[PDB]
PDB file of C-alpha atoms in Angstrom:
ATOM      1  CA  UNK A   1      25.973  13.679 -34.661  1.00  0.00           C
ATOM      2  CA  UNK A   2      24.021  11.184 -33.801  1.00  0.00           C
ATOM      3  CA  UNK A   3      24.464   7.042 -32.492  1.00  0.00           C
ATOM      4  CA  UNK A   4      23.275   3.059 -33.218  1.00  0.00           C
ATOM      5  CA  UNK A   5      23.876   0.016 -30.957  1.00  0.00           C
ATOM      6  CA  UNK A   6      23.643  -3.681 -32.125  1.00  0.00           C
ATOM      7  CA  UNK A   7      20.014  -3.356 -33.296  1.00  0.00           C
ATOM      8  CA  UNK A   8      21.276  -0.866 -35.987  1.00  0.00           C
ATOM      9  CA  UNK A   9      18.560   1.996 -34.631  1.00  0.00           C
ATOM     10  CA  UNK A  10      19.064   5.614 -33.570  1.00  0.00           C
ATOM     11  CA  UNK A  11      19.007   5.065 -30.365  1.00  0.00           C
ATOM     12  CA  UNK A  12      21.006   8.250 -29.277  1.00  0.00           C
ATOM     13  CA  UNK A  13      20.879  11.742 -30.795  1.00  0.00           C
ATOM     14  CA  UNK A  14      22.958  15.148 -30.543  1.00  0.00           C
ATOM     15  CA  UNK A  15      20.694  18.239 -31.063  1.00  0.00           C
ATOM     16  CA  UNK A  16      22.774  20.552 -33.014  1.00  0.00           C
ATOM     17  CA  UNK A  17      21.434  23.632 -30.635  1.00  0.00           C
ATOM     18  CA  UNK A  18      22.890  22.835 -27.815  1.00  0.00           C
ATOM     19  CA  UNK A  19      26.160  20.631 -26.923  1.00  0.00           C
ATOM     20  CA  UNK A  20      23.520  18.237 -24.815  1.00  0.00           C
ATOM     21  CA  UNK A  21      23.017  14.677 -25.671  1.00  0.00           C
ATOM     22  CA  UNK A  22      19.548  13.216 -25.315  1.00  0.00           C
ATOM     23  CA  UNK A  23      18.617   9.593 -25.664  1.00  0.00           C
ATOM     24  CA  UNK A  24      15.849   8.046 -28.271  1.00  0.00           C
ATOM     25  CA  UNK A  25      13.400   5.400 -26.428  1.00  0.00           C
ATOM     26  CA  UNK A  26       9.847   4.453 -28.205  1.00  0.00           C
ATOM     27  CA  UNK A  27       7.136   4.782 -25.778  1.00  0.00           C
ATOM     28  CA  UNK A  28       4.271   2.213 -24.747  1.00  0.00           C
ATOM     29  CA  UNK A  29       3.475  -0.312 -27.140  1.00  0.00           C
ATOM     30  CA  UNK A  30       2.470  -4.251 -27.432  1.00  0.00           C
ATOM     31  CA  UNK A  31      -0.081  -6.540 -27.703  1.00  0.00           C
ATOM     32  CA  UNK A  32      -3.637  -6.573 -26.195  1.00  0.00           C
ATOM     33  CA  UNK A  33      -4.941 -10.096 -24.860  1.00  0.00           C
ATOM     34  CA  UNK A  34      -9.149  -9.932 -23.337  1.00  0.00           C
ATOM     35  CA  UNK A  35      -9.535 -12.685 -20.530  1.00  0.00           C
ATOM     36  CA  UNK A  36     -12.750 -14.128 -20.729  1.00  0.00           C
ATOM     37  CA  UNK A  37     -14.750 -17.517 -19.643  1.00  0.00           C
ATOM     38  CA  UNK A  38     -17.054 -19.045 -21.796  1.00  0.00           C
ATOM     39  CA  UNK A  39     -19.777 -16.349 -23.254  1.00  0.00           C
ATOM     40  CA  UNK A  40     -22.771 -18.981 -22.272  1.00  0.00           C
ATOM     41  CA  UNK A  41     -21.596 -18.336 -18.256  1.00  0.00           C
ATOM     42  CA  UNK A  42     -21.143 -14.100 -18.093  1.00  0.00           C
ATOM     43  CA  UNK A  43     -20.102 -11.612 -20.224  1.00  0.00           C
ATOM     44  CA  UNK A  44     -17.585 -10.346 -17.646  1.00  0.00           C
ATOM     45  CA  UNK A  45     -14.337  -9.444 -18.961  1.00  0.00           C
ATOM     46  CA  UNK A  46     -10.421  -8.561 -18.080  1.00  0.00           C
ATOM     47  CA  UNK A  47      -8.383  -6.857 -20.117  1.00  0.00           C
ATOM     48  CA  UNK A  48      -4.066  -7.440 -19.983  1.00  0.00           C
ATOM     49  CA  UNK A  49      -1.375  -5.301 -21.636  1.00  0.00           C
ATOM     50  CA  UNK A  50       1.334  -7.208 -22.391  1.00  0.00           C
TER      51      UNK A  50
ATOM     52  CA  UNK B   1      26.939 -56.948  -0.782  1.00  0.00           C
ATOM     53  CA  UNK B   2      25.718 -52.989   0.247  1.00  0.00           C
ATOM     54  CA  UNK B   3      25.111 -53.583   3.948  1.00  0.00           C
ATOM     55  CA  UNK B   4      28.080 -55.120   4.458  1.00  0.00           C
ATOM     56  CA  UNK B   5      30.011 -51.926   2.872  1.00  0.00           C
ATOM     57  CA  UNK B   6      27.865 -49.218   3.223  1.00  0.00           C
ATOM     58  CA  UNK B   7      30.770 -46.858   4.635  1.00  0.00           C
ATOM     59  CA  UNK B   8      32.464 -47.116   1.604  1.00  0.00           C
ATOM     60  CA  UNK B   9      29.815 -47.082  -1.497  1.00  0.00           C
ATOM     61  CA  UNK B  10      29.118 -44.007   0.911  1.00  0.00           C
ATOM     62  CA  UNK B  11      32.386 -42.553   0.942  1.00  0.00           C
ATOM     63  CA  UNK B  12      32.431 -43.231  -3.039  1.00  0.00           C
ATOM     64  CA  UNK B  13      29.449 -41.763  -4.015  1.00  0.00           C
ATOM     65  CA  UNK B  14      29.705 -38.717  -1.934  1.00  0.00           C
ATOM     66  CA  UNK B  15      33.806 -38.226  -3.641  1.00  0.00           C
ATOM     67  CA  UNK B  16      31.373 -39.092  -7.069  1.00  0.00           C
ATOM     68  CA  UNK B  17      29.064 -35.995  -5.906  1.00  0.00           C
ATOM     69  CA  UNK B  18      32.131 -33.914  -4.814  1.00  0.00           C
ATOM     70  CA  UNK B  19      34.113 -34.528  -8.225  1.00  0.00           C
ATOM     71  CA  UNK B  20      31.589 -34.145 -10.251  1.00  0.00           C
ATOM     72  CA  UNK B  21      30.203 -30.539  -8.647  1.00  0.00           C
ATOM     73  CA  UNK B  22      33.848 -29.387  -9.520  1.00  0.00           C
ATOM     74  CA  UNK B  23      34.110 -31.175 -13.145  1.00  0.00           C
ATOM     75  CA  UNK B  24      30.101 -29.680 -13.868  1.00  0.00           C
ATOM     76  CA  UNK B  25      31.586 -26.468 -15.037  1.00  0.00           C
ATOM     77  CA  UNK B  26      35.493 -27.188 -15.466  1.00  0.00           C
ATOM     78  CA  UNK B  27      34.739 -26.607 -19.563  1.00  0.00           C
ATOM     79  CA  UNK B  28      32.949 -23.944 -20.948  1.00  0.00           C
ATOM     80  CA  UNK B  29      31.671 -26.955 -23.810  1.00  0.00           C
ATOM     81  CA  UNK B  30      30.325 -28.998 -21.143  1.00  0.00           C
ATOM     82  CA  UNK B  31      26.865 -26.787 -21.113  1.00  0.00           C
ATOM     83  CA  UNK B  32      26.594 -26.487 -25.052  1.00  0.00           C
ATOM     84  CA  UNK B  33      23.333 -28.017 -25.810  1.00  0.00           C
ATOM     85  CA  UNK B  34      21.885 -24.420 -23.673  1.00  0.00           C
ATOM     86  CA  UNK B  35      24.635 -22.153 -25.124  1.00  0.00           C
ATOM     87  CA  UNK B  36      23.666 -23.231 -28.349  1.00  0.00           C
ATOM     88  CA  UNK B  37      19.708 -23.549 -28.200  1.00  0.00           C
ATOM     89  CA  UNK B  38      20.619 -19.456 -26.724  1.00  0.00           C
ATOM     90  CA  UNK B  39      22.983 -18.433 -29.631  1.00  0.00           C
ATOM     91  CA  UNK B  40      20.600 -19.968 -32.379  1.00  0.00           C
ATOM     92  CA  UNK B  41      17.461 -18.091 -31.096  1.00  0.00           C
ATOM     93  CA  UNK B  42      19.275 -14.682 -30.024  1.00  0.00           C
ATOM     94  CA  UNK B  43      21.188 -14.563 -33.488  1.00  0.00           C
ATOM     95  CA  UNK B  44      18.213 -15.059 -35.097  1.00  0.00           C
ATOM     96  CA  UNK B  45      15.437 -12.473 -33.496  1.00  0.00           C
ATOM     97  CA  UNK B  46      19.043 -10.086 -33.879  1.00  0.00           C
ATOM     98  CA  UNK B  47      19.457 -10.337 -37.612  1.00  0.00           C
ATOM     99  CA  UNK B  48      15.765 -10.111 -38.374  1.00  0.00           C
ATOM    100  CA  UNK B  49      16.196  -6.700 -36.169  1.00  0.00           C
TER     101      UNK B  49
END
């Protein structure tokens, strides 16, 4: 019915409706890091996804 | 004693360079300090998965 790898998650799944096979991937995630100077110079900011 | 023989510390240090280019991965243990500084970090992130 269904399938792991070696990170013991579902990571492949067989919809009983069909005879199809469709794969599981999580979408976007991570950590959020603001590049700034010093807040006495400018408030100007950059934001990076990591 | 080098300028007098410099053909031959030549000769020996490139047959050094040459033997030791083939004997740098003749054994897979030769490379374990990397292997193992891999395997102990990998192993690790893998069984807190």
């Amino acid at each position: 019915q269904f399938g792991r790898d070696i990170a013991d998650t579902t990571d492949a799944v067989r919809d009983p409706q069909t005879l199809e096979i469709l794969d599981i991937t999580p979408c976007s995630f991570g950590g959020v890091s603001v590049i700034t100077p010093g807040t006495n110079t400018s408030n100007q900011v950059a934001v990076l996804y990591q | 004693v080098l300028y007098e023989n410099q053909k031959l510390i030549a000769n020996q240090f490139n047959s050094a360079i040459g033997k030791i280019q083939d004997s740098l991965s003749s054994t897979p243990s030769a490379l374990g300090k990397l292997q193992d500084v891999v395997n102990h970090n990998a192993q690790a992130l893998n069984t807190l998965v």
